[PDB]
Amino acid sequence: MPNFFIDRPIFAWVIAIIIMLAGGLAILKLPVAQYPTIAPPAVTISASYPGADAKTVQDTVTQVIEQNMNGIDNLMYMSSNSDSTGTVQITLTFESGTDADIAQVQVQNKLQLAMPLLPQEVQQQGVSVEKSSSSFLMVVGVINTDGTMTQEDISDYVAANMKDAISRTSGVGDVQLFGSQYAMRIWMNPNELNKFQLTPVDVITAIKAQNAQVAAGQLGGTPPVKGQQLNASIIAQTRLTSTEEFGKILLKVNQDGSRVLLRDVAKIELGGENYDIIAEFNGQPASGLGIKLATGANALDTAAAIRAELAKMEPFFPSGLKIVYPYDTTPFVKISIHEVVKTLVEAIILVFLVMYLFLQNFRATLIPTIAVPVVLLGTFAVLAAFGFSINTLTMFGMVLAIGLLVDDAIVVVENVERVMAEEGLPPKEATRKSMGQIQGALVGIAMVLSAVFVPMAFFGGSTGAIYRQFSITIVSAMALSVLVALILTPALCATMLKPIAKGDHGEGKKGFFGWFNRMFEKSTHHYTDSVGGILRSTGRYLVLYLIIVVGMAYLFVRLPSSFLPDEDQGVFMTMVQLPAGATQERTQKVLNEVTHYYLTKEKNNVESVFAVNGFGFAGRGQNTGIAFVSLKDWADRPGEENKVEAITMRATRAFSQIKDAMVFAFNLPAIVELGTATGFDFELIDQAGLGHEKLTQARNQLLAEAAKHPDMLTSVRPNGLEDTPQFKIDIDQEKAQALGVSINDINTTLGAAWGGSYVNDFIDRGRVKKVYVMSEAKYRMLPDDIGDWYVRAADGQMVPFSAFSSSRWEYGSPRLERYNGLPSMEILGQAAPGKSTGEAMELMEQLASKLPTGVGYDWTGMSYQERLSGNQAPSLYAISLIVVFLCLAALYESWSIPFSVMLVVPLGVIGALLAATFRGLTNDVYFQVGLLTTIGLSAKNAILIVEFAKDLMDKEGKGLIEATLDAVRMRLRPILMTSLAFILGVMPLVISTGAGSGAQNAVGTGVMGGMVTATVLAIFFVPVFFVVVRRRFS
Amino acid sequence: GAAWGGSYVNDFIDRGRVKKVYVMSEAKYRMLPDDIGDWYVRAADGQMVP
Amino acid sequence: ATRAFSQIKDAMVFAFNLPAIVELGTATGFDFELIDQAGLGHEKLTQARN
C-alpha cells in the first residue's frame, strides 16, 4: 500500500480530503455534553397521598405498586421510599444497554393496570413515571427584588409564561417547574363552621356541586325534525374562574332566611398546591425551572438558546422580576472542552517545533502538521458514525491518542529523512525504502495496540461505560493514524521532501543548529558505546530489571484507587439537617445563618446562595434543607484557598459550631448521575416479616459490630431517618355509633382539616388549577387544637373529637424503605485508608452473617457493580496479553522474539506509578488510560527497535551485537523527539490548576512520568532483552 | 344532559353482540330554544318544577 | 399408564409425552374453528358443531 500511494499522491490527497470532509461534517453534527450516559437506565415512579404518614403510604401505595412490578424486562433491582410527607418514590434499575424508552413504557403500563388498586386520592394526584438516570442541564431561577411577589406568585408566573417557551427551545429535552401553579385555597375556620352548623364534608360537597362542567347537548342535534334550520351547541354550568365566585358558593340557608356562603366559614385565596418547600435566592423569594438536555443535543448550543429565550422574555416581565442562574455548570464544560482543544493545538505546534529542531527542514515539519489533523478529523467522523458525542472522556482520550498519532507521523517522516541523509537517495526512492522497512512493523503495531486498547470496551457497568469512551476513541485514532501513515504520509514525503546529500547530517551548519547537530551526534555515539558496554554484562541489568519490576509491584499495591478526580465546577452544596420534629421556621433560620455566612465571610468567592428549605438529600421534610452555593468565575478566585475544596472545608469548620443542626458543605461528584466513591452501599432486608422494630434492632447490632472494626470500615452509617414521635388519635367507633357520628365523617373531617383535601379543578385565566380545602393554619398546629373540631351526628348535634376519640404519643418511622419489594434499611460506608472496597464488602458480609434470624442483606448501587465486575480485568488483560504475543510472533516469525518486546511494560508503568505517588494522585480512570497509552508507546518503540535489529540480522549478515547497536543508533532520534514532543504537550496538563485541573492533572502526571521513564529505560533495556532472548533461544 | 345531548346508560346484547343503550329526548322536544320550558325536574316534595 | 387409566370409569385420564416443539404439535394434526358469523347463537352453533 505504501508503494501504491507513492506513485499516486493525488489519490492519497483525495482520500485525505474525504477524511477531512467527513470529520468536518461530524464536528458540525456531533452532540456535545459533559459526560455520556454512564448510569444504568433507571425508571422512577412518584406518587403523592397528601396528609399521609410513611406507613399509610407504604401499605396503601408502595406495596400495591411493588406487587405489580412484574414482567418488566432487564430489571436489575427495585427500591422504594415512603415518606411522612405522603410521597412514595420507587426506583427501578435496569441493566446497562437497556432501552430506557422501552423500560419506561413497560413500567408505566404495569402501573396503569395497578392504578385501580390505589386510593382514590393517589389516583387524583396522579402517579408519574419518569427517567431519573439523567441530571439537570441548567437551573433558571426567577426572583422578585421588590417584595411585591411571593414565592407562589413567581412560581405561577413562571408556569404560565415561561415554561412553555423554554420547553419549545431547541435542544431542551425536559423542563421541571420548581413550584406549582396557583391553587384555590379554602382555609376553614372550625369555630365559624360550628357556628353555622357545618363541617368540612359539607364544604367539599358544596364545592364539588357548584364547581363542575356539565354536558348540556346541542340545539337541533341529529336526529333532527324534517324542517330544522338552526343547529347550535348548548352551553351550561362551567368551572368557576375567580376567588369571588368561590366565595359566593352557598353551603346552607338558615331557617330565618340568612344565607351561609363559603366566605362565611372560610378564607378563599390563591395559594400554592403545596407549601412543603420554600426556595430563596440570597434571601429573596424565588421559583425556578430545571432544564434537562434532550438526547443527541449540543449542551452548549442548548444553553445558549435557553439564555437567548430568557433574554427575549426579559422585557415583558413584571417590574422587579429578575432571572438568575444558581446552578450553571455549563461554563465549566465550556472551559474544559476549550482547554482540551487548546492542548491538542499546542501539541501539534510543539510537534512542528520539535520536528524542526531535530530535522531542520520546513517541509518535513509540514508533513506531520498535515497528517495529524487528518487523523483527528477522521476520528471525529468515526465517533459520529458509531453514535458517540464530544464529551470529557472522548476529548481526553483524543489528548492521550495524540502521543501515538505524533509518534506515527514522526516515525515515518524521520525514517525517510534518515534514509535520505544516509543512502543519499532522492525523496521518492528513499520513501520507498523507508516504507519497505517500516510498513510491516506499522501493521503489527496497529494490531498490538488494538489488542491493548479493545478490552476496555468490554468492561461491565458504569465503569465499563466510562472506559468504552476511551477505548473507542483511542482505537479509532490509532487505526486512522496507521492508515494515514500507510497512505498519505508516504505520498507527502515523496512529493514534498527535498533531496539531501549522501553524507550530510547537519555537521557543516553554523550557529545553534550546528551546535545542536554536533551535540546530538556526540550523544548518539556515547549512547551507542554505553549500550555496547551494557550488552557485555546483561546479567546485572536483568537483576536491575527484576528490581524495577518489584518496585513497580510495590508502588501498584500501595497506590490508592479511585474513579474520577473531583473538580472545582464553580458550585457546591450544603446540607442542613435539624433534629426530629423541627419545623420549617427553625430550618429556615439555620439556612439564613448559612446564607449570611456565605454572603459575608466568603463574599469575595460566593456569587449567590440558593437555599431550599423542605428537602435535603436522602429525605424531604421541614427539618431538612439544601443550599446550592454558586461561586464567582475562576479568574476572580485565584489561589488554592479560593477553590471549592478550601471553601467547603472552611464552611464546614465554621458551621460545625451551629447548635441543634448538622450543617455540612461538600462538592459535587465528578458525575452527579452517580453518587460514588471508594465506598459501599449495603441493604439490610427483612426476609421473614420480622417488622420495623426488629429490623431496626438488627441494623443497630450491625452498626455496632461495624464500629468495632475501625481499621477496615469507616463511617458506617444508615441512609435514613430514625423513628420520631407521632400523634395517635385512637377513635372509639362504639362511641361514634352511640352518638350517631359516622366514622367516615370523622375521618374526612380529620383529614381535610389537618391533612388538606383536593376537591376538583377550576379554570384560572385559561388554565386548570387545583382546588384545595384545608384548615386555616391557626387551628391545626398543636394537639389541643384537636378540641376545636366538631362533627355533626345523625341527630344533627355536633360532637367534639374528645367525645369519641382519645389521643396519645407513640413512635413511628418518618421514612420507610423497601428493597426488591421487602422492608429494608440502607447503610453507607467506606473502606478504611489502605483497604480495598472488596475487603470492606467481605467484612460487612461476615458481620451480616451474624445477625438475627430472618434478616438478610444485599449489595446495591456501586457495590452491585463491584460484585458483578470484580475479576473481569485480569481476564480481559490476560486475553489482551496473549493476543499481543500472538501478533508479535506473527510479525517476527518467532515464538521467542516477542518476549523482548513484551518485557517493556514495567519500564513505563514504574514511571507512571512514581509520578502519581509523588504527586499524591490515585489509581483512577484517567491514570489507567494514560498508563495504557504509555505502554502502547513503549511497545511501539520496542517493536521498531527489534524490527530493525532482526532486519539487519536476517536481510544482512550483521551479527547480533552489531545489529542491535546499529538498530538502537538508528532508532534513538525518533524515540527521543517523539518523547520530547509528547512530554512538552502534556506539561500544561501537569501544571494546570484552574477549571478542570483535576482531570487534567490525572491525565497528565501519569503520562509524563511513564513517558519519561519509558524513554530513559527502554533505549538501553530493549537491546538487552533482544540480545538475551536471541542468545537463549538460538 | 340526557334530554338534549343524550346519556349512554349501559350495555345490552343485540344478536349476541354488546351494544350501547342511549336515553335522549324525541327530536321535536329538543329542536328550538323554546323547548327548554317543556322539560321538568322533580322536587323533594314531589312537585314538577319547569 | 394410559392403558391402566381406562378402568377408572369416573374420568377421562390420559398420560402423554410432549413433542420436540410444543407449539408445532403432531405433524398430522389439525386445529379447526367453527365460527358463528350470523349471530345464530350458542345453541345453533352447538347444533352445527354436532
Ligand SMILES: NC1CCN(C[C@@H](O)COc2cccc(C(F)(F)F)c2)CC1
Ligand atoms: N415544589 C417545588 C418547590 C421548589 N423546589 C425547588 C428545588 O427542588 C430546586 O432546588 C434544586 C436546584 C438545583 C438542582 C436540584 C436537584 F437536586 F434536584 F438536581 C434542586 C422543588 C419543589
